[PDB]
């Protein structure tokens, strides 16, 4: 579980998303496992807008934040689940480090801010679904 509160948004995993979640939508797209909906009270998170290839991210599995290097957003196939069939995921950076079910919506973090949220992993991986690209989030 996790989410990313910035402005009158709240950013959560597609798969884990809530009724309230859906209620008041703004965006959501499956292939990216992305879903955004708005909110009564201000977040005051930072995303980030650069190109960063390291961060710490947060992994829940373990109660410890870990620096990861990562892969730049790209389409990576994903297995078929409760969620989704198998499919191409896109704008998802991996790095190797721990992850298992649950970690889902912790945040990966540069010096520059947020960059995203745990969205896959496995084999000693870690997906992160990017958020960097969303430049209305702040406007
Ligand atoms: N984006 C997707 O389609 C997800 C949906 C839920 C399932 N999923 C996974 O990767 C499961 C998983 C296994 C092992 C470690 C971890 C995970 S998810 C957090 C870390 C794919
Ligand atoms: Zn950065």
Redesign the pocket.
């Known amino acids: 579980s996790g989410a990313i509160y910035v402005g009158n948004y709240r950013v959560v995993?597609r798969?884990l998303a809530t009724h309230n979640d859906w209620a008041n939508l703004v965006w959501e797209d499956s292939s990216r496992?992305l879903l955004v909906s708005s909110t009564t009270a201000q977040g005051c998170d930072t995303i980030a807008r650069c190109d960063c290839q390291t961060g710490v991210y947060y992994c829940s599995s373990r109660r410890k934040h870990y620096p990861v290097s990562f892969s730049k957003p790209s389409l990576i196939f994903?297995?078929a689940?409760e969620?989704?069939p198998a499919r191409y995921?896109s704008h998802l950076m991996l790095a190797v480090g721990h992850?298992?079910?649950?970690?889902?919506g912790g945040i990966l973090r540069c010096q520059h801010g947020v960059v995203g949220i745990?969205?896959?992993?496995?084999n000693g991986l870690?997906?992160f679904a990017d958020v960097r690209d969303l430049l209305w989030l702040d406007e």
């Open positions: 995993n798969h496992d994903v297995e689940s969620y989704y995921q992850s298992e079910p649950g970690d889902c745990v969205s896959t992993g496995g870690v997906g």
